[PDB]
Enzyme design. Sequence first.
Site, mmCIF file in Angstrom:
data_model
loop_
_atom_site.group_PDB
_atom_site.id
_atom_site.type_symbol
_atom_site.label_atom_id
_atom_site.label_comp_id
_atom_site.label_asym_id
_atom_site.label_seq_id
_atom_site.Cartn_x
_atom_site.Cartn_y
_atom_site.Cartn_z
ATOM 1 N N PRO A 87 10.263 -49.051 24.754
ATOM 2 C CA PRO A 87 10.363 -47.902 25.574
ATOM 3 C C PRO A 87 11.043 -48.350 26.841
ATOM 4 O O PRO A 87 11.009 -49.509 27.240
ATOM 5 C CB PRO A 87 8.919 -47.526 25.909
ATOM 6 C CG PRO A 87 8.000 -48.320 25.009
ATOM 7 C CD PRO A 87 8.872 -49.334 24.313
ATOM 8 N N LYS A 91 3.261 -50.530 22.079
ATOM 9 C CA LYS A 91 4.459 -51.209 21.683
ATOM 10 C C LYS A 91 4.368 -52.552 22.405
ATOM 11 O O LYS A 91 3.798 -52.659 23.493
ATOM 12 C CB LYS A 91 5.699 -50.417 22.024
ATOM 13 C CG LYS A 91 6.132 -49.518 20.877
ATOM 14 C CD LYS A 91 7.606 -49.118 20.937
ATOM 15 C CE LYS A 91 8.049 -48.057 19.915
ATOM 16 N NZ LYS A 91 9.437 -47.577 20.130
ATOM 17 N N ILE A 144 11.267 -44.708 20.950
ATOM 18 C CA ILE A 144 11.491 -44.385 19.557
ATOM 19 C C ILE A 144 10.130 -44.016 18.982
ATOM 20 O O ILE A 144 9.275 -44.878 18.696
ATOM 21 C CB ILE A 144 12.213 -45.473 18.784
ATOM 22 C CG1 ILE A 144 13.556 -45.742 19.416
ATOM 23 C CG2 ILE A 144 12.553 -44.927 17.409
ATOM 24 C CD1 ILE A 144 14.179 -47.011 18.850
ATOM 25 N N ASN A 166 10.626 -36.990 32.618
ATOM 26 C CA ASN A 166 11.297 -36.497 31.416
ATOM 27 C C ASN A 166 11.030 -37.408 30.211
ATOM 28 O O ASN A 166 11.240 -38.625 30.295
ATOM 29 C CB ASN A 166 12.800 -36.275 31.658
ATOM 30 C CG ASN A 166 13.093 -35.057 32.538
ATOM 31 O OD1 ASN A 166 12.178 -34.359 32.993
ATOM 32 N ND2 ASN A 166 14.370 -34.786 32.767
#
EC number: 5.3.2.1
Lengths: 115, 115, 115
Positions: A2, A33, A65, A98
């Site tokens: 990320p 992650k 992802i 966002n």
Amino acid sequence: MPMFIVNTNVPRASVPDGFLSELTQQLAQATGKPPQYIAVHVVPDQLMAFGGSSEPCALCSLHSIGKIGGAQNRSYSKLLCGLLAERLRISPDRVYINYYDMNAANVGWNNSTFA
Amino acid sequence: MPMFIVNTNVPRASVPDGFLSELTQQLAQATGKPPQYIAVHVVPDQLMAFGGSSEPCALCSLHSIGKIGGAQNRSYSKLLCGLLAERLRISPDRVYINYYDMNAANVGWNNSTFA
Amino acid sequence: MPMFIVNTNVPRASVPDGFLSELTQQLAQATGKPPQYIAVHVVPDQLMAFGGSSEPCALCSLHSIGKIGGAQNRSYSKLLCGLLAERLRISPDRVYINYYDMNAANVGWNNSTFA
């Protein structure tokens, strides 16, 4: 997967010392992650306005992802706004984040993509 | 909700007093969202090129939860290139504006996300 | 169409002077678009971490109206990673590139959109 970016008008000097580390650790747990795959970017001293005002604020982005979605987005927010309020002294209602659910064929890394 | 970002190679000193405000006011009117929700971020002094030339230029983005679309983007373009041209002196054929229609669950704010 | 941005913690002084032109020519060839349309933005000296470390890294994004795809991307990553490694001495595994295929209606330019 990320990547977290923070843009804020708060001054460089107010960014606490192990801030990047902290973010990294935290995002690591929140998304589950591994840290070494986590990228963090903080941009202070920006010329910004929120709702017309210049008091402290931030525009952030979280790219990943998968691991992005309805409820998840809600916890990231909490977590994130929480850290920002806490470390940079920014009010949460003065923060936007966002979230982008990236497709693997669309993330280049080391001579290839994650697809 | 919306967030507008301007990245340009024009020098900070060339940004008029009042610019953040003007932008917040014009966008509110343009999108029909109260100013309270508009975030604006201007980044001058950037290292950039457009067409291989380093004459004045800008890369911008507008993110909104709705109010984005074919005809709307066209008017935002006219509006925005017009201001950059008059206030910042950037030629409109040297500006790119990316439009993003954001999904409410993907905008974090105030410890949560919208809906 | 295309717009390439590189954010990196390498210092400004390490960014070669013809770097923006170099990227510009190379992306024109890779994408098959005339150089006139290529925009490049390089942002050094950033506060970033990748995998928890502050060794040199880069967060990039490439936006294009078309020419984006599973395979093209793999190829772009190689080109880009090659360039950043040679010119900025960045290790290819400390680099991410986000690929964005944009709709023509979502890109503003010269007072209107491409649609």
